[model samples]
Target: QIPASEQETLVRPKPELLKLLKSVGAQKDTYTMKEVLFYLGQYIMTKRLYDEKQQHIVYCSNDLLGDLFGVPSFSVKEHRKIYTMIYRNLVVV
Candidate 1:
């Protein structure tokens, strides 16, 4: 598991996420980029068809998220890399 402080950093707003949130009238102090990304990701996820047979959550690609949310795709990729790595490096033992 990730420590709370590092997790917070992953979700913190970079300029792009900040701009997107501001454009949508979300007060900066009330949100973080990680939450915004999750919202967008979940929205797209809901639009996908599901199978009870499936074991994992559906994924929304960074490009698709960027297109839907009007944020830059490149930056989305950058943010995702950092966010994913936090968990990717974790050890259970």
Candidate 2:
């Protein structure tokens, strides 16, 4: 067991692209995935997701991708559907 004051380690993508990819791939989003992905990577690189001095995330979870790609919004439901399909495909192999 981890001791108090010793934070638990968590693993997660800093700039997760799966949902962004899923949105564009299914034709549910306005902009193309490739462009969004490209710009988002640039945005993160330029702005940096976390600031050592600031000690906070640069962008909020929901708005980061949308803002970078200039989209208004995205649907979480679509991302889940795509994940289901991907899971099925992977399990078949």
Candidate 3:
């Protein structure tokens, strides 16, 4: 039997999500969830999406992020839902 550690999981982004991924230089055909989140976090930090006074709040400053989240802003406390939204844009391959 194969160990869980040896399992392989990869996901391909949908068109709109792929556009966002490409904008951040993540042009891979497939990626692990960790890799996807890493790029997203880097992009958020670089773009300064988090609120100044309320750091837990992240703003959808760009059209891409806004469109993806369908919101003007969201709290970091809802990160699980945020991740679910992002995962919805990917297909396991």
Model 2 superposed RMSD (Cα): 13.5
The global Cα lDDT (0 to 1) of model 3 is: 0.75
Clashes per model (N, Cα, C within 3 A): 0, 0, 0
Task: Please provide, for model 1 over 1-93, each residue's C-alpha lDDT reduced to its tens digit, 9 standing for 90 to 100.
Answer: 435554444344445544544454456443443455555445444555223355243333454334333333223244556455323322211
lDDT of every predicted structure (CA atoms): 0.43, 0.36, 0.75
Top candidate on TM-score is 3
Between candidates 1 and 3, the one scoring higher on TM-score is 3
Please give, for residues 55-89, the per-residue lDDT of candidate 3 as tens digits.
Answer: 98998956677877677888867756777678678
| Alpha-carbon runs more than 4 Å astray in model 1 | 10-34, 49-52, 59-63, 66-82, 85-93
State the lDDT of candidate 2 residue by residue for 2-70, as single tens digits.
232222222122223445444434323233323433444455545455455654334434564533333
- TM-score of the candidate numbered 2? 0.25
TM-score of each: 0.35, 0.25, 0.78
